[PDB]
């Protein structure tokens, strides 16, 4: 067709108003007389706009259709599909540096409530400036806001600060993991490792491979006391040599604190537990004391015995101390 | 079909089927933009499609709208290796899609972005495997390049300051929780008194949660039914509030009808007292106790506890 | 140059309308009534194939940068946004969303030489936690990833409406509901000995660091610590000049160190249990050797230009010790 500019106007007699333009170079501008990208939409959208009409470009879908989706496609080993968010202060003609606390980009989800959409969004992942930007500083952070049930406004729940510190329910996390609440791990039940003349038995919630692939992990939880004993090799000597830390399963239980370690060829674990009710027994099986029991033990998977066994443990039944290596 | 040519390159096309192509003579979606944007492009002109806003306007926003119980609004990111004509499977470690934020600093934008959420391939993809991971990058104050701070790996393991998290929660630093003050649960002839930072309902709704912090020692005693048996029946772990304090370790549990807690504390100074109230020892104190909200007494009570004050052990059930 | 004008709407038909430039200045593709500067509504059926399952799509190749979609804003008030709108029913008649229904999603698709992964390879989704009304608009954020050797993204993390974050948990009851292990850095072995020969300490942290990381707990596995202060700190008590002489062994033990302060300097509460530890008096004679456990409160003392033990107590085998 044309050999240069191609502009579209509306109500020209009433008031000169350009709408779209196909430049000679091949760029398309909607609301902009000078597009800077293949397709630049600039028609002014005032604050008066109502949801879901508060945007420049919009795809739409319905029922089982898949048209209400926006995409970026790249077939390259070097580049990547991107959703770029550019932010600056001042104005487009004269862009100025962003200030500290200035929001840069946001991914907001709006939901209809039969009447309208939620002002401010129902859930937002935002990028915010952590400091006034300069040619020497471009600090930024990421925040995650969601709306509590029965509420109508998204609140900041998590933050990945410029320093890398993650804060849950914390605005300025000073810790690498600053939590404003409780920490919950899985309930791994009760542990058992008995090695006696009668045989070898063990109840371990993990497997040799798992522990070997999870070195340095701590697990804390609440459950009945453990039953531990090795009157033959691992727990063979010491002041109290063949003792059995015979825990009684109770509703009160106690807190297990187990961290993973290794022998260099097999999985090992450091276990700690305190609670009710525990009875200390000797190799013969006679009860020495019964009641509150506390214990620290170091168990490891022994392939020679095809099961887990205690290498050394020490603790206290009531006011009596026992050590067993 | 309707083509829009310039002098003699075709720029736009409205096909008979109703698809629109900008830079593509064969669009595959309602509106496909393909005009070549070379690497030479500078910010903020490095993109195929771009919305723009100004001041108080809301035009600089890109949206996807869906009215359906089945489908959902999506921002789809497709990535492949090779070329468009001959696309091939992605490689291990290859980036798939990214959500990047650029910020002007009065002269330019930060090359690489100031903060980005990226999706990366964890393995060479095939018909048998499509593993992927999510990374979160941010720029530190005084820096000019976004660095990977967090990662949700293909296995679900979250890594904070860790590239290959082997733990379900692999943190490369300290873990901090709220300071819950000092706890007290005394049941005496003088009365029933207790200072608990939580409420029965709260503990019942937070089972299995661990809380650690530093504060002055606790004051615990039950000299009537629970603790008044065993080696040291009436016993008071009379902790003195000191600057050094000690580390509390409290995990939530239950009786089946009310909240219970397992408490641990060590530090200085502590005074062991008997039911009569005479001091048996003073100094370093350690204790493990199991308290629980007893409605019959309308307050928290100690079910059973045992510890060591200085080098003397004490027990109470 | 060149241009064309119209007094009002301008429709394009290929039969039947495919595009339209309204009098107000809006452009609609597949919609006879656009509501934004550029509104695309051409119906895309479920039959569509990847990567053609979308209304609008940018494309890039090799070293080019056109496969990017962007939002630009130059304002102190507004910010670049990627708005995702979701409603029930239909576009003409939108209705409130249901509980648990997904609202918006950012999914990444990857080619496997034959096709793209149905459902996406990794997705950040926003989901409704309750039926919406004028009184409630509860929502949550989910993070889905695909395991190596798998072909479907699974929900790995969730930031619920209540702020509770879950790793491998659907309904996090804890602000940090983890369905697995928690691992921290291995800070080695700690040492703080103050004797007639002098004062020495092996601390993996700095006074400044500890002062700037108050209330943080660190747990790990390593050999036992070597602690003693026979001069000022642990100079009194039942066991006055004790040295908790740990022997470095493969079995080691679990350290539990939490940060505190004196009000002017960094302090720490340390706990350690394990094998093999030797109890020694100020003179240096071994009282016992074997299983050792200890609790200690150390702090950086500037008078000594190093870390020292203020008070410590524990047990070696069955014999108990305390010092302050």
PDB file of C-alpha atoms in Angstrom, chain A residues 45-226:
ATOM      1  CA  UNK A  45      -6.644   5.401  30.253  1.00  0.00           C
ATOM      2  CA  UNK A  46      -7.776   7.760  33.050  1.00  0.00           C
ATOM      3  CA  UNK A  47      -8.217   6.875  36.707  1.00  0.00           C
ATOM      4  CA  UNK A  48     -11.964   7.182  36.074  1.00  0.00           C
ATOM      5  CA  UNK A  49     -11.761   3.730  34.477  1.00  0.00           C
ATOM      6  CA  UNK A  50     -13.574   0.889  36.224  1.00  0.00           C
ATOM      7  CA  UNK A  51     -12.553  -2.737  36.484  1.00  0.00           C
ATOM      8  CA  UNK A  52     -11.890  -4.677  34.254  1.00  0.00           C
ATOM      9  CA  UNK A  53     -11.234  -1.735  31.917  1.00  0.00           C
ATOM     10  CA  UNK A  54      -8.187  -0.285  33.713  1.00  0.00           C
ATOM     11  CA  UNK A  55      -5.515  -1.335  31.229  1.00  0.00           C
ATOM     12  CA  UNK A  56      -4.030  -0.591  27.827  1.00  0.00           C
ATOM     13  CA  UNK A  57      -4.027  -4.087  26.298  1.00  0.00           C
ATOM     14  CA  UNK A  58      -6.305  -6.989  27.166  1.00  0.00           C
ATOM     15  CA  UNK A  59      -6.966 -10.535  25.934  1.00  0.00           C
ATOM     16  CA  UNK A  60     -10.350 -12.129  26.643  1.00  0.00           C
ATOM     17  CA  UNK A  61     -11.598 -15.686  27.055  1.00  0.00           C
ATOM     18  CA  UNK A  62     -14.917 -17.332  27.820  1.00  0.00           C
ATOM     19  CA  UNK A  63     -16.206 -20.734  28.891  1.00  0.00           C
ATOM     20  CA  UNK A  64     -13.952 -23.452  27.484  1.00  0.00           C
ATOM     21  CA  UNK A  65     -12.030 -21.058  25.218  1.00  0.00           C
ATOM     22  CA  UNK A  66      -8.347 -20.282  25.784  1.00  0.00           C
ATOM     23  CA  UNK A  67      -8.220 -16.796  24.261  1.00  0.00           C
ATOM     24  CA  UNK A  68      -8.056 -14.911  27.555  1.00  0.00           C
ATOM     25  CA  UNK A  69      -4.313 -15.572  27.764  1.00  0.00           C
ATOM     26  CA  UNK A  70      -1.272 -13.365  26.990  1.00  0.00           C
ATOM     27  CA  UNK A  71       1.969 -14.977  25.874  1.00  0.00           C
ATOM     28  CA  UNK A  72       5.616 -14.386  24.987  1.00  0.00           C
ATOM     29  CA  UNK A  73       7.256 -17.023  22.770  1.00  0.00           C
ATOM     30  CA  UNK A  74      10.979 -17.532  22.234  1.00  0.00           C
ATOM     31  CA  UNK A  75      12.809 -20.286  20.320  1.00  0.00           C
ATOM     32  CA  UNK A  76      16.374 -19.604  21.397  1.00  0.00           C
ATOM     33  CA  UNK A  77      19.255 -21.025  23.370  1.00  0.00           C
ATOM     34  CA  UNK A  78      20.283 -17.496  24.367  1.00  0.00           C
ATOM     35  CA  UNK A  79      17.174 -15.396  24.970  1.00  0.00           C
ATOM     36  CA  UNK A  80      14.141 -16.097  27.141  1.00  0.00           C
ATOM     37  CA  UNK A  81      10.433 -15.345  27.106  1.00  0.00           C
ATOM     38  CA  UNK A  82       9.936 -12.301  29.308  1.00  0.00           C
ATOM     39  CA  UNK A  83       7.161 -10.137  30.812  1.00  0.00           C
ATOM     40  CA  UNK A  84       9.092  -6.872  31.232  1.00  0.00           C
ATOM     41  CA  UNK A  85       7.922  -4.236  33.690  1.00  0.00           C
ATOM     42  CA  UNK A  86       9.503  -0.793  33.299  1.00  0.00           C
ATOM     43  CA  UNK A  87       9.069   1.848  36.008  1.00  0.00           C
ATOM     44  CA  UNK A  88      10.308   5.411  36.377  1.00  0.00           C
ATOM     45  CA  UNK A  89       9.237   8.555  38.191  1.00  0.00           C
ATOM     46  CA  UNK A  90       8.279  11.897  36.688  1.00  0.00           C
ATOM     47  CA  UNK A  91       6.835  11.614  33.187  1.00  0.00           C
ATOM     48  CA  UNK A  92       7.409   9.581  30.005  1.00  0.00           C
ATOM     49  CA  UNK A  93       8.949  12.559  28.132  1.00  0.00           C
ATOM     50  CA  UNK A  94      11.265  13.286  31.103  1.00  0.00           C
ATOM     51  CA  UNK A  95      11.744   9.999  33.055  1.00  0.00           C
ATOM     52  CA  UNK A  96      13.446  10.465  36.438  1.00  0.00           C
ATOM     53  CA  UNK A  97      15.000   7.955  38.816  1.00  0.00           C
ATOM     54  CA  UNK A  98      12.753   5.977  41.138  1.00  0.00           C
ATOM     55  CA  UNK A  99      12.683   6.718  44.868  1.00  0.00           C
ATOM     56  CA  UNK A 100      13.017   4.434  47.882  1.00  0.00           C
ATOM     57  CA  UNK A 101       9.838   2.451  48.466  1.00  0.00           C
ATOM     58  CA  UNK A 102       8.581   3.093  44.933  1.00  0.00           C
ATOM     59  CA  UNK A 103       6.683   0.183  43.400  1.00  0.00           C
ATOM     60  CA  UNK A 104       8.302  -0.944  40.135  1.00  0.00           C
ATOM     61  CA  UNK A 105       6.241  -3.831  38.727  1.00  0.00           C
ATOM     62  CA  UNK A 106       3.322  -5.914  39.901  1.00  0.00           C
ATOM     63  CA  UNK A 107       1.412  -9.089  39.019  1.00  0.00           C
ATOM     64  CA  UNK A 108      -2.099  -8.580  40.420  1.00  0.00           C
ATOM     65  CA  UNK A 109      -5.078 -10.941  40.287  1.00  0.00           C
ATOM     66  CA  UNK A 110      -8.591  -9.462  40.400  1.00  0.00           C
ATOM     67  CA  UNK A 111     -11.678 -11.501  41.292  1.00  0.00           C
ATOM     68  CA  UNK A 112     -15.352 -10.729  40.704  1.00  0.00           C
ATOM     69  CA  UNK A 113     -17.749 -10.914  43.659  1.00  0.00           C
ATOM     70  CA  UNK A 114     -20.948 -10.777  41.623  1.00  0.00           C
ATOM     71  CA  UNK A 115     -20.845  -6.967  41.863  1.00  0.00           C
ATOM     72  CA  UNK A 116     -17.308  -5.851  40.982  1.00  0.00           C
ATOM     73  CA  UNK A 117     -13.582  -6.588  41.366  1.00  0.00           C
ATOM     74  CA  UNK A 118     -11.521  -5.946  44.481  1.00  0.00           C
ATOM     75  CA  UNK A 119      -9.870  -2.529  44.568  1.00  0.00           C
ATOM     76  CA  UNK A 120      -6.152  -3.118  44.992  1.00  0.00           C
ATOM     77  CA  UNK A 121      -6.364  -6.725  43.832  1.00  0.00           C
ATOM     78  CA  UNK A 122      -6.993  -9.996  45.627  1.00  0.00           C
ATOM     79  CA  UNK A 123      -3.350 -11.148  45.467  1.00  0.00           C
ATOM     80  CA  UNK A 124      -0.202  -9.394  44.247  1.00  0.00           C
ATOM     81  CA  UNK A 125       3.497 -10.167  43.701  1.00  0.00           C
ATOM     82  CA  UNK A 126       5.188  -6.768  43.637  1.00  0.00           C
ATOM     83  CA  UNK A 127       8.735  -5.552  43.024  1.00  0.00           C
ATOM     84  CA  UNK A 128       9.649  -2.535  45.139  1.00  0.00           C
ATOM     85  CA  UNK A 129      12.631  -0.209  45.272  1.00  0.00           C
ATOM     86  CA  UNK A 130      14.618  -0.584  48.491  1.00  0.00           C
ATOM     87  CA  UNK A 131      16.608   2.606  47.904  1.00  0.00           C
ATOM     88  CA  UNK A 132      16.663   5.719  45.752  1.00  0.00           C
ATOM     89  CA  UNK A 133      18.186   4.462  42.514  1.00  0.00           C
ATOM     90  CA  UNK A 134      21.332   5.908  40.968  1.00  0.00           C
ATOM     91  CA  UNK A 135      24.019   4.860  38.465  1.00  0.00           C
ATOM     92  CA  UNK A 136      25.713   3.068  41.398  1.00  0.00           C
ATOM     93  CA  UNK A 137      22.628   1.612  43.134  1.00  0.00           C
ATOM     94  CA  UNK A 138      19.597  -0.354  41.885  1.00  0.00           C
ATOM     95  CA  UNK A 139      18.408  -2.179  44.991  1.00  0.00           C
ATOM     96  CA  UNK A 140      15.016  -3.898  44.843  1.00  0.00           C
ATOM     97  CA  UNK A 141      12.888  -6.380  46.799  1.00  0.00           C
ATOM     98  CA  UNK A 142       9.930  -8.698  46.148  1.00  0.00           C
ATOM     99  CA  UNK A 143       6.746  -8.743  48.235  1.00  0.00           C
ATOM    100  CA  UNK A 144       3.821 -11.178  48.255  1.00  0.00           C
ATOM    101  CA  UNK A 145       0.416  -9.822  49.334  1.00  0.00           C
ATOM    102  CA  UNK A 146      -2.829 -11.800  49.710  1.00  0.00           C
ATOM    103  CA  UNK A 147      -6.227 -11.050  51.255  1.00  0.00           C
ATOM    104  CA  UNK A 148      -7.431 -12.791  54.404  1.00  0.00           C
ATOM    105  CA  UNK A 149     -10.805 -14.515  54.349  1.00  0.00           C
ATOM    106  CA  UNK A 150     -13.574 -12.064  55.137  1.00  0.00           C
ATOM    107  CA  UNK A 151     -11.350  -9.129  54.147  1.00  0.00           C
ATOM    108  CA  UNK A 152     -11.390  -6.857  51.104  1.00  0.00           C
ATOM    109  CA  UNK A 153      -7.756  -5.733  50.936  1.00  0.00           C
ATOM    110  CA  UNK A 154      -4.509  -7.527  50.160  1.00  0.00           C
ATOM    111  CA  UNK A 155      -1.890  -7.429  52.922  1.00  0.00           C
ATOM    112  CA  UNK A 156       1.851  -8.056  52.658  1.00  0.00           C
ATOM    113  CA  UNK A 157       2.521 -11.597  53.886  1.00  0.00           C
ATOM    114  CA  UNK A 158       6.047 -12.328  52.630  1.00  0.00           C
ATOM    115  CA  UNK A 159       9.117 -10.411  51.526  1.00  0.00           C
ATOM    116  CA  UNK A 160      12.394 -11.296  49.800  1.00  0.00           C
ATOM    117  CA  UNK A 161      14.511  -8.262  50.638  1.00  0.00           C
ATOM    118  CA  UNK A 162      17.351  -6.774  48.617  1.00  0.00           C
ATOM    119  CA  UNK A 163      19.738  -8.500  51.046  1.00  0.00           C
ATOM    120  CA  UNK A 164      18.174 -11.890  50.299  1.00  0.00           C
ATOM    121  CA  UNK A 165      16.581 -12.217  53.731  1.00  0.00           C
ATOM    122  CA  UNK A 166      13.105 -13.752  53.563  1.00  0.00           C
ATOM    123  CA  UNK A 167      10.531 -12.463  56.027  1.00  0.00           C
ATOM    124  CA  UNK A 168       7.226 -14.187  56.791  1.00  0.00           C
ATOM    125  CA  UNK A 169       4.870 -11.722  58.412  1.00  0.00           C
ATOM    126  CA  UNK A 170       7.922  -9.461  58.790  1.00  0.00           C
ATOM    127  CA  UNK A 171       8.563  -6.289  56.811  1.00  0.00           C
ATOM    128  CA  UNK A 172      12.321  -5.880  57.341  1.00  0.00           C
ATOM    129  CA  UNK A 173      13.656  -9.410  57.946  1.00  0.00           C
ATOM    130  CA  UNK A 174      16.972  -9.246  59.794  1.00  0.00           C
ATOM    131  CA  UNK A 175      17.353 -13.049  59.715  1.00  0.00           C
ATOM    132  CA  UNK A 176      17.901 -15.128  56.596  1.00  0.00           C
ATOM    133  CA  UNK A 177      14.508 -16.674  57.546  1.00  0.00           C
ATOM    134  CA  UNK A 178      12.660 -14.220  59.831  1.00  0.00           C
ATOM    135  CA  UNK A 179       9.405 -15.911  60.876  1.00  0.00           C
ATOM    136  CA  UNK A 180       6.682 -14.128  62.849  1.00  0.00           C
ATOM    137  CA  UNK A 181       5.063 -17.272  64.214  1.00  0.00           C
ATOM    138  CA  UNK A 182       5.373 -21.007  64.664  1.00  0.00           C
ATOM    139  CA  UNK A 183       7.467 -23.530  62.738  1.00  0.00           C
ATOM    140  CA  UNK A 184       5.764 -26.921  62.081  1.00  0.00           C
ATOM    141  CA  UNK A 185       7.462 -30.140  60.799  1.00  0.00           C
ATOM    142  CA  UNK A 186       5.997 -33.605  60.139  1.00  0.00           C
ATOM    143  CA  UNK A 187       5.118 -35.961  62.973  1.00  0.00           C
ATOM    144  CA  UNK A 188       7.513 -38.873  62.414  1.00  0.00           C
ATOM    145  CA  UNK A 189       6.062 -40.994  65.215  1.00  0.00           C
ATOM    146  CA  UNK A 190       8.242 -42.778  67.756  1.00  0.00           C
ATOM    147  CA  UNK A 191      11.731 -44.230  67.258  1.00  0.00           C
ATOM    148  CA  UNK A 192      12.927 -47.629  68.426  1.00  0.00           C
ATOM    149  CA  UNK A 193      16.323 -49.362  68.247  1.00  0.00           C
ATOM    150  CA  UNK A 194      16.846 -52.453  70.426  1.00  0.00           C
ATOM    151  CA  UNK A 195      19.904 -54.706  70.045  1.00  0.00           C
ATOM    152  CA  UNK A 196      20.049 -57.583  72.552  1.00  0.00           C
ATOM    153  CA  UNK A 197      20.767 -61.302  72.785  1.00  0.00           C
ATOM    154  CA  UNK A 198      17.146 -61.870  71.814  1.00  0.00           C
ATOM    155  CA  UNK A 199      17.729 -60.170  68.485  1.00  0.00           C
ATOM    156  CA  UNK A 200      17.694 -56.850  66.659  1.00  0.00           C
ATOM    157  CA  UNK A 201      14.616 -54.714  66.071  1.00  0.00           C
ATOM    158  CA  UNK A 202      14.209 -51.145  64.888  1.00  0.00           C
ATOM    159  CA  UNK A 203      11.372 -48.751  64.015  1.00  0.00           C
ATOM    160  CA  UNK A 204      12.879 -45.880  61.987  1.00  0.00           C
ATOM    161  CA  UNK A 205      10.685 -43.413  60.039  1.00  0.00           C
ATOM    162  CA  UNK A 206      13.488 -42.961  57.480  1.00  0.00           C
ATOM    163  CA  UNK A 207      15.678 -45.189  55.325  1.00  0.00           C
ATOM    164  CA  UNK A 208      19.461 -45.362  55.088  1.00  0.00           C
ATOM    165  CA  UNK A 209      19.372 -43.731  51.647  1.00  0.00           C
ATOM    166  CA  UNK A 210      17.040 -40.947  52.807  1.00  0.00           C
ATOM    167  CA  UNK A 211      19.211 -40.005  55.790  1.00  0.00           C
ATOM    168  CA  UNK A 212      22.303 -40.125  53.583  1.00  0.00           C
ATOM    169  CA  UNK A 213      20.611 -37.734  51.134  1.00  0.00           C
ATOM    170  CA  UNK A 214      19.407 -35.373  53.890  1.00  0.00           C
ATOM    171  CA  UNK A 215      22.559 -34.668  55.907  1.00  0.00           C
ATOM    172  CA  UNK A 216      22.363 -31.771  58.339  1.00  0.00           C
ATOM    173  CA  UNK A 217      18.555 -31.710  58.542  1.00  0.00           C
ATOM    174  CA  UNK A 218      16.848 -31.220  61.911  1.00  0.00           C
ATOM    175  CA  UNK A 219      13.400 -32.641  62.674  1.00  0.00           C
ATOM    176  CA  UNK A 220      11.475 -31.680  65.816  1.00  0.00           C
ATOM    177  CA  UNK A 221       8.037 -32.999  66.773  1.00  0.00           C
ATOM    178  CA  UNK A 222       5.978 -34.515  69.605  1.00  0.00           C
ATOM    179  CA  UNK A 223       5.343 -38.220  70.218  1.00  0.00           C
ATOM    180  CA  UNK A 224       5.811 -40.984  72.768  1.00  0.00           C
ATOM    181  CA  UNK A 225       9.240 -41.874  74.114  1.00  0.00           C
ATOM    182  CA  UNK A 226      11.740 -44.101  72.323  1.00  0.00           C
TER     183      UNK A 226
END
